[PDB]
Amino acid sequence: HVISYEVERDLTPLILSNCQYQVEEGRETVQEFDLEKIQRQIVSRFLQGKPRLSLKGIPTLVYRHDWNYEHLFMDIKNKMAQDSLPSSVISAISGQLQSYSDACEVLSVVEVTLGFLSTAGGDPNMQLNVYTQDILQMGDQTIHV
Amino acid sequence: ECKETASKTLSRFGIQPCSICLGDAKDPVCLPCDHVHCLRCLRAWFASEQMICPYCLTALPDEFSPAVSQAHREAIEKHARFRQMCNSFFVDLVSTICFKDNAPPEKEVIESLLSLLFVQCEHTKSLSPFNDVVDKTPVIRSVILKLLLKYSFHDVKDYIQEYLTLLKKKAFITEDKTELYMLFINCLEDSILEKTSAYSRNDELNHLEEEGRFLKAYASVEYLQEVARIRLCLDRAADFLSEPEGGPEMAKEKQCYLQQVKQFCIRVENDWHRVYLVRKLSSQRGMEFVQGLSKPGRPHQWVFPKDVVKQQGLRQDHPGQMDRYLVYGDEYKALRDAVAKAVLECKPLGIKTALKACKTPQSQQSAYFLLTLFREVAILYRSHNASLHPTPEQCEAVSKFIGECKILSPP
Amino acid sequence: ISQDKRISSNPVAKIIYGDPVTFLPHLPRKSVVHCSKIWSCRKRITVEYLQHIVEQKNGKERVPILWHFLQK
């Protein structure tokens, strides 16, 4: 796909193979070349159709400074629809979440759920306790979570 | 036969040449005898007041008046561009495919093309298989010669000899073979430099070494090829030594190549090669460089001619600082020599004599004055010799001159 | 240039402005090969010279592909 040529290998031998020497009686030489034929030769040998589009060439290394939730949330919201937390649900959680450790465990489950929900995406109506149980196979959850 | 049968829809009777012009027609009138005649060329023969058509030998009545036809003119010109473009572009592009590889096709193919090269007063058409019209006085076209020369020279020596023999049997053209021999030499030079000097650097230096070894073991087209190859060798030596200071190394092959070139120059006993080398160097970086570097007595004088060096040492007064400002005219030369004489002889009337005889506007006149002041004072002062510098008395003379003349009004 | 007197006062100048056949009798003669036109300096046709040809002809729109080739 590259237009590959050398100044001395294909350029001068071609250009000097079309340098036209014509002598008229009583007059000196005329040097006009066949510019159209030169263009034809160039477009045949080199300029045949071969295009390109810039999409990569990027140093997508292993890590490059991860760990922000804003872009994670952007992926979540642009990959599926997200609702809000109903008042009944917030009241029930604030009632049955009496310890910091319980909140930590629930959030630990929710973070893995977020990661999978971003990298793959799923049904916004599937129950969370199903997605975490037989879709991600997290078969070690407690009963309080 | 494609072209012979194409002339059916583009012309009701078929396009045929005339006799007044012996070819195509301009402002073409179709006579009642169905003959396309050029009105512009009709006038040249009808100014004699004898209306005779020599083709069909028809004594047309004087009442009929040939005139301009629009539809007929466009019908003629359509084909007059048709067949030219078709035949020309086909013949060149088939020459591309008929002679692609290094192997010549055959003896017969090229011989038939060369016999087709004349129309079958021999060369009048533009190298076609048809009976195309008469062009200008026969021009020796080299459009196909170059593509008949990309092969090896030795294998095509017979071809070149046959081509030159058939060219010399062309017509009553003068036998001054200079103007065509130079063309043949230049064309074979182009062929050899485009097919034997473009491999690579290592292959090129191996080729140069082999050429040098063969030169150690050392009208006709062989003589022309020898002249061209020695010309290329001396030009290569010239631009290979024509390099500024900074390359003392690499002389392992440089000292060999320059020495062998000078050995050939000594052996040939001909000064044409060295005068050509001087011309090539002057075209490369100027006649001033070759007039200053090859000064009388310079150890660098083996490349440049010797008798020229002696007869220039006898003329060592003039180094060659030639006044390249002649593009304006001889008037500038006149006032320049007048100013030089006036300053040298210590008087202002010499400059004034040229001052009076100047009809041009005074702006470029002051330009001439300042530029002549440069050409004399600065060039004489450029030499390191203080004696050759303009004398301080001359400086006071030109000072009281500029105080005398008021042409230089701007401060 | 050839008409000015100082160019006619140096053999090296006469080499490019004038013929050695009418100047130096030491030069060989009697051969059609040795003459002014045949042994005259030429100019190599480099790619930039083709650019010059395109510019002076102003076949600028005539060969757009060739235009873009010798452009950059």
**HEC sequence for A6-72:** CHHHHHHHHHCCCCCCEECCCCCEECCCCHHHHHHHHHHHCCCCCCCCCCCCCCCCCCCCCCCHHHH
Residue recorded with tokens 């592009």: B93
The tokens for A129 are 């306790």
- The answer to whether B51 faces chain A, any CB pair under 8 Å, is no
Q: SS3 of B101, please?
A: coil
- Reported structure resolution in angstroms: 3.5
Q: How many CA atoms lie within 13 A of B2 on its CB side?
A: 6
- State phi, psi for B293 to the nearest 5 degrees: -70, -45
CB of C11 within 8 Å of a chain B CB? The answer is: yes
For residue A43, which residues of chain B lie inside 8 Å, CB to CB?
none
Stated as kind and residue range, the H or E segment containing B36 is strand B36-38
Q: By what technique were these coordinates determined?
A: cryo-EM
State how far the Cα of A43 lies from the Cα of B227, in Å rounded to an integer. Answer: 37
The SS3 assignment for B39 reads helix
Using only C-alpha atoms, what is the Rg of chain C? Answer: 20
> Mind giving me the DSSP string for C20-58?
GGGT-TTS--S-SSSSTTTT-------HHHHHHHHHHHT
Q: What's the Cα-to-Cα distance from B405 to each of B324, B349, B353, rounded to whole Å?
A: 27, 11, 13
Q: Distance (Å, rounded) from C-alpha B75 to C-alpha B28? A: 10
Q: What contacts C23, CB < 8 A, 6 or more positions away?
A: C11, C14
> Cα separation of B180 and B187, whole Å?
10
C62 touches chain A (CB under 8 A): yes
What does the buried/exposed string (b/e) look like for C14-44 if buried means 16 or more CB atoms within 10 Å of the residue's CB? bbbbebbeeebeebeeeeebbbeebbebeee
- Tokens, residue B309: 């060096």
- The Cα of B36 is separated from the nearest Cα of chain C by a number of Å equal to 34
| Cβ B45 vs Cβ B20: under 8 Å | yes
What distance in Å separates the CA atoms of residue A32 and residue A30, rounded to the nearest whole number?
A: 6
- Tell me whether residues B308 and C39 touch, CB distance under 8 A: no
- Residues shown for chain A: 145
Q: Tell me the C-alpha to C-alpha distance, in Å, between residue B177 and each of A71, B139, B144, B162, C18.
A: 85, 14, 20, 15, 22
* Alpha-carbon distances of C45 from A19, B70, B305, C48, rounded to whole Å: 8, 45, 28, 8
Q: Given CB atoms, is C65 within the 8 Å cutoff of chain A? A: yes
Task: Identify the CA nearest to A15 among candidates B231, C72, C49.
Answer: C49
Contact: B272, C12; criterion CB under 8 Å: no
Q: Are B376 and B340 in contact (CB under 8 A)?
A: yes
Q: What are phi and psi of B53, to 5 degrees?
A: -95, 105
Residue type, B243: E
Q: Which residue of A has its CA nearest to C37?
A: A28
Q: Which of chain B's residues have a Cβ under 8 Å away from the Cβ of C37?
A: 178-179, 182
